[PDB]
């Protein structure tokens, strides 16, 4: 038939790894992003961008190695290898943090390709595309945290660096400079994630503990076969158990599984809204009434004020080394300390 | 299977070893060697200051 038809037939062939049309975007972008992350964590340093050593070649381990964000002198530059910052020089491109931009951009396009892959495989198998809508959660997380937040900030420098200790540093930095725990959208995200973990554990235990005795063996994993027209566990027994134990219970399996889908997705989207708010320093950092009460009453103290003091400590005692481009020099007298309050 | 791999997998590994052993890794990825983190003069942390003169700046910083 037509070239398209033949190419569509070949891309849709039942192989060990499905390719599809979405594969043409997914496989190269994802492969390049993963390979660039490995290259950065193995060879590329962060000495000229953050003043830090972040490579196995420099002596770092799995936790401390990272693909660090570009220098704060680069701004929000695409940092193309052929761009005016690097001008085709691979060494200078790696030294200025261009590999982080490489990984971030090719990884965003890889996430788009994987979402399209979910859509295409769902369209093939004939099922509703409730995947690639669940994956919209992780997509929104990545877009808000690694793309929208640095774009709202001064440069790519304040984006999370692709590493374990780098991610921990990003957590503490955001807590210090934004008080992100106090953000209600982050609270909804935490509620969504913890509720999703709760739902996963409780649903697994409930199904495992309400199975029908469909086998003579003590180990009950053999009693199930995929070509079953009968349910493998008792929904009525589970509903009775949770209705007389917790006071309320699921009676519809569809609604239960949609809820288990909905909770983490809603949590991730709320957290994404919160991070988008943080991108412009539009943060729920402080309560004005509590600050006014503490200002006119030295004997008034709550855990919120202690959190404010802790965030001040993170900001002052990390600013010097976390933002070396600013050339922050703080004398010991100006550094906040509990002893001097 | 085992015939061809017996002569390329070893080489692949050795190549990686040499890449680092020779020091080409440092030259290719600009990673500073342990003896060239701070130049006698530049005893401070080297940081790029301008985006459009980043290549020249880095050439000046890494010339030593």
């Amino acid at each position: 038939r037509g070239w398209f038809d033949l190419a569509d037939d070949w891309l849709k062939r039942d192989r060990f790894v499905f390719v599809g049309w979405s594969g043409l975007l997914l496989f190269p972008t994802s492969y390049l992003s993963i390979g660039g992350w490995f290259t950065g964590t193995t060879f590329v340093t962060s000495w000229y961008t953050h003043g830090l050593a972040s490579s196995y070649l420099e002596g770092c381990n799995f936790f401390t190695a990272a693909v660090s964000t570009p220098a704060n002198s680069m701004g929000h530059s695409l940092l193309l290898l052929w761009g005016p910052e690097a001008q085709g020089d691979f060494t200078r491109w790696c030294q200025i943090g261009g590999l982080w931009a490489f990984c971030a951009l090719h990884g965003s396009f890889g996430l788009i390709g994987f979402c399209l892959r979910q859509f295409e495989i769902a369209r093939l198998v004939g099922i509703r595309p409730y995947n690639a809508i669940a994956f919209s959660g992780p997509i929104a997380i990545f877009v808000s945290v690694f793309l929208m937040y640095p774009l709202g900030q001064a440069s790519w420098f304040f984006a999370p660096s692709l590493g374990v200790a780098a991610i921990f540093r990003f957590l503490l930095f955001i807590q210090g400079f934004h008080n992100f725990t106090l953000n209600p959208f982050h609270m909804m995200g935490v509620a969504g994630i913890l509720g999703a973990a709760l739902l996963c554990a409780i649903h697994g235990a409930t199904v495992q503990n309400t199975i029908f005795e469909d086998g003579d063996a003590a180990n009950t994993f053999r009693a199930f076969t995929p070509t079953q027209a009968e349910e493998t566990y008792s929904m009525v027994t589970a509903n009775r158990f949770w209705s007389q134990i917790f006071g309320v219970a699921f009676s519809n399996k569809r609604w239960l599984h949609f809820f288990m889908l909905f909770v983490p997705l809603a949590g991730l989207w709320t957290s994404a809204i919160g991070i988008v708010g943080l991108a412009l320093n539009l943060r729920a950092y402080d309560f004005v009434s509590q600050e006014l009460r503490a200002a006119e009453d030295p004997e008034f103290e709550t855990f919120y004020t202690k959190n404010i003091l802790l965030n001040e400590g993170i900001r002052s005692w990390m600013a010097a080394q976390d933002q070396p481009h600013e050339n922050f020099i703080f004398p010991e007298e100006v550094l906040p300390r509990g002893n001097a309050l | 299977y085992w015939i061809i791999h017996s002569i390329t997998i070893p080489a692949l590994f050795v190549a990686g070893w040499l890449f680092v052993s020779t020091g080409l890794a440092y030259d290719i990825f600009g990673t500073p060697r342990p003896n060239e983190y701070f130049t006698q003069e530049r005893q401070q942390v080297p940081l790029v200051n301008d985006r459009f003169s980043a290549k020249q700046e880095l050439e000046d910083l890494t010339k030593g």
């Binding site: 790894v17 | 190549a15 990686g16």
Partner: peptide, 29 residues
């Protein structure tokens, strides 16, 4: 096969990086 390619695209860098990291282990650090 296409699998061949994907497997080698994973493996040829994987073995190269394993050799590089093993060499990094014997650096004076």
């Amino acid at each position: 096969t296409f699998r061949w390619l994907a497997i080698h695209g994973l493996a040829v860098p994987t073995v190269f990086f394993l050799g590089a990291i093993t060499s990094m282990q014997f650096i004076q650090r």
